[PDB]
Amino acid sequence: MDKTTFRLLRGESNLFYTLAKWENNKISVELPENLDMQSPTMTLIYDETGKLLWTQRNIPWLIKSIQPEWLKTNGFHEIETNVDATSTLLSEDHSAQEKLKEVREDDDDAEMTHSVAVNIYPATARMPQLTIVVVDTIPIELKRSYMHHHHHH
Amino acid sequence: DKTTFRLLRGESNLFYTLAKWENNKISVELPTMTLIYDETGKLLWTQRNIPWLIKSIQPEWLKTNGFHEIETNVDATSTLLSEDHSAQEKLKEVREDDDDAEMTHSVAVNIYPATARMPQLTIVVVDTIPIELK
Amino acid sequence: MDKTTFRLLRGESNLFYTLAKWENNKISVELPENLDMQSPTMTLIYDETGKLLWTQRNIPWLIKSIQPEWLKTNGFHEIETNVDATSTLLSEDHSAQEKLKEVREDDDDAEMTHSVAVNIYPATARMPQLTIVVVDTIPIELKRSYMHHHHHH
Amino acid sequence: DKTTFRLLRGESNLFYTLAKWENNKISVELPTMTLIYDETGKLLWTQRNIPWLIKSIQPEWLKTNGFHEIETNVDATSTLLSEDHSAQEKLKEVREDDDDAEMTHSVAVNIYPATARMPQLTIVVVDTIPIELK
Ligand SMILES: [Ca+2]
Ligand SMILES: [Ca+2]
Ligand SMILES: [Ca+2]
Ligand SMILES: [Ca+2]
Ligand SMILES: [Ca+2]
Ligand SMILES: [Ca+2]
Ligand SMILES: [Ca+2]
DSSP: OOHHHHHHHHHHHHHHHHHEEEOSSOEEEOOOTTOOSOOSEEEEEEOTTSOEEEESSOOHHHHHHSOGGGGGSSEEEEEEEEHHHHHHHSOTTSTHHHHHHHHHHHOTTOEEEEEEEEEEEOOBTTBOOEEEEEEESSOGGGSOSOOOOOOOO | OHHHHHHHHHHHHHHHHHOEEOSSSEEOOOOEEEEEEOTTSOEEEESSOOHHHHHHSOGGGGGSOEEEEEEEEHHHHHTTSOTTOTTHHHHHHHHHHOTTOEEEEEEEEEEEOOOSSOOOEEEEEEESSOGGGO | OOHHHHHHHHHHHHHHHHHEEEOSSOEEEOOOTTOOSOOSEEEEEEOTTSOEEEESSOOHHHHHHSOGGGGGSOEEEEEEEEHHHHHHHSOTTSTHHHHHHHHHHHOTTOEEEEEEEEEEEOOBTTBOOEEEEEEESSOGGGSOSOOOOOOOO | OOHHHHHHHHHHHHHHHHEEEETTEEEEOOOEEEEEEOTTSOEEEESSOOHHHHHHSOTTGGGSOEEEEEEEEHHHHHTTSOTTOTTHHHHHHHHHHOTTOEEEEEEEEEEEOOOSSOOOEEEEEEESSOGGGO
């Protein structure tokens, strides 16, 4: 797979693991000091059952896109969606919203694909088994600023 | 049988009267056990949480009004009824006769067409005393 | 369902599919070389209509037991019958005939259950749609050589 | 849907008839392409020798019977079919519009239980005309 993607999603998953606390049979997440940019990712936290315990943003369509089968192993997946749903996942002021505006006019039946990483953190003395799902919010279709063209001379 | 039909259908109609659809979710209030399903075949309400009974109800049975049979063992039929029900002594003899005995139980399905107030309800009623004790 | 039963009945069904030829608006089945054990199964072959095209053995009662609604999808069913009818499905020399003899004295009116498997083979260039039904001739009640007993100590 | 199922499954069954297991190895005698695998997930025979198609077949798809899709570009779908195949003029039009157009092809996986004759065969069948020309 793409290496930058692996670094970003796994890194974010691990980071959330370090910020999660378990108190009163409930998960909370610390907002850390000195965090310099907002990651273009959305994190979900599940227990061993598949019950959603913590969700970073309430996107009801995306939570349903996450298949129960995915939650049982460490792996990578993709969710195919449309341009109106991808604009949901990004802040209204993020500069990819303008890229999505230009996709809408060129072809509003344009499909967008989001990477999804699942990682399982085994139960430890003061924390149960946490399954963390991180979604990349910028679709693969818009990663690049240009497309190579094959010229022969 | 005529008598068994009157018993299971009347019981199914009684729960149709008691069922109320509010906030997009069923709400019932109050020798049979009754389960209620929706048009997709999902289970909306059960009179008692018995996981073996639920499973034995074949989902094809729900597409139609019809009368069926559900086979289980004497230990499960005995754990269906109250701990000091009248028929425990009768099922005790058939157990000491044959520990692995086979009980079968009658099952009525009936579909209630949708209405302004409430959607299609499919109601499944199990006779909790088997046909072996009749 | 039981995994041995699935493999037995589907395997036999596919086998019969490979051995079927369609000639002169009629089905025939090859008897293959080097066929070691004989499956303890009875196969029926039907056309898209529900008309019987080929039966492995003519057992009127069992052919009438195959409900026409079964023929419309791929699925597994069961036929509840009695000991005398089950003896009709097995060769007189097969060793479960003596198990059937021992049931017939232990309990007069014992019920026997046979598994049944329906698989549809779509029409191909040289063959119309074929619906094959395989019956397991050993009833489930006699599958096992013993019954576990729950001992506590 | 229904029409493509009859086509891809009929084809997969046809290759099951044509498959023979001799000397502990497979041998098949002879608009789709068919691949045949073993129980472990390894590929035992393919009707062509196209590396991108072989890879696009996700190894999880092999554990069950089911129907999938595989996406590739218009140039790879054009190179899949014969040089002067019927629908090349159609795909030439889609290239002239969008050089990098996206085509998607239907895939059918099917498992054939082991047998005295041969072991479990898993048979995968690609429709070589994409769903965009339907
Ligand atoms: Ca997806
Ligand atoms: Ca543009
Ligand atoms: Ca795509
Ligand atoms: Ca005995
Ligand atoms: Ca029985
Ligand atoms: Ca019975
Ligand atoms: Ca697509």
